[PDB]
């Protein structure tokens, strides 16, 4: 399961996995906002490539 | 490692080779309350000195 995969990647950079399980919804919201910002900067800017 | 269930009983194992052990307080660590983890499960954590020492 995907949150268990994210918990052991957090463990790979030296954070304990309870930090992820206790902040799971904040972390998923920050990810969804960052994807939306990538999409806006590609959808209106014309020198990126 | 990871908590796994064989259908009836809960164990802890390493991720790349299957070798199930009893969940004790040397296998695990405590942090926080049971209401902030999505998907937590009710089970017992055995204390490894209560049969060997009650002197
Ligand atoms: C899941 O694991 C438990 C724990 O070992 C199994 O229960 C044991 O089964 C053996 C053989 O039938 C018995 O000798 C033990 O006394 C049982 N232990 C306990 C605590 O009851 C259980 O059978 C396993 N289930 C499956 C489907 O493999
Ligand atoms: C896991 O165990 C806890 C504690 O025994 C259960 O929490 C209780 O839930 C009932 C209603 O379901 C409440 O009225 C109690 O006040 C709760 N106890 C505590 C100490 O908060 C929980 O329901 C169990 N979960 C499962 C899935 O069995
Ligand atoms: C897994 O999905 C079920 C619905 O099929 C849901 O009830 C359960 O809470 C989910 N568990 C986790 C850990 O998200």
Curated annotation (Swiss-Prot), chain A:
UniProt superkingdom: Viruses
Record's function text: Subunit of the fusion protein that is processed upon entry into the host cell. Mediates fusion of the virion and cellular membranes by functioning as a class I viral fusion protein. Contains a viral fusion peptide that is unmasked after S2 cleavage. This cleavage can occur at the cell membrane by host TMPRSS2 or during endocytosis by host CSTL. In either case, this triggers an extensive and irreversible conformational change that leads to fusion of the viral envelope with the cellular cytoplasmic membrane, releasing viral genomic RNA into the host cell cytoplasm.
Descriptive protein name: Spike protein S2'
Native source species: Severe acute respiratory syndrome coronavirus 2
From Swiss-Prot, chain B:
Phenotypic consequence of residue 9 to Y: In strain: Theta/P.3
Effect of mutating residue 26 to H: In strain: Alpha/B.1.1.7
Glycosylation sites per record: 6, 42
Role description: Subunit of the fusion protein that is processed upon entry into the host cell. Mediates fusion of the virion and cellular membranes by functioning as a class I viral fusion protein. Contains a viral fusion peptide that is unmasked after S2 cleavage. This cleavage can occur at the cell membrane by host TMPRSS2 or during endocytosis by host CSTL. In either case, this triggers an extensive and irreversible conformational change that leads to fusion of the viral envelope with the cellular cytoplasmic membrane, releasing viral genomic RNA into the host cell cytoplasm.
Protein name: Spike protein S2'
Range within the parent protein: 1093 to 1147 of 1273
């Amino acid at each position: 399961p995907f949150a268990m995969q994210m918990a052991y990647r957090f463990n790979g950079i030296g954070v304990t996995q309870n930090v992820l399980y206790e902040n799971q919804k904040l972390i998923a919201n920050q990810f969804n906002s960052a994807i939306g910002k990538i999409q806006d900067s590609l959808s209106s800017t014309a020198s990126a490539l | 490692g990871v908590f796994v269930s064989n259908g009836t009983h809960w164990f802890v194992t390493q991720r790349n080779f299957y070798e199930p052990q009893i969940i004790t307080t040397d296998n695990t660590f405590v942090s926080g309350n049971c209401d902030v983890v999505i998907g937590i499960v009710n089970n017992t954590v055995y204390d490894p000195l209560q049969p060997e020492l009650d002197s």
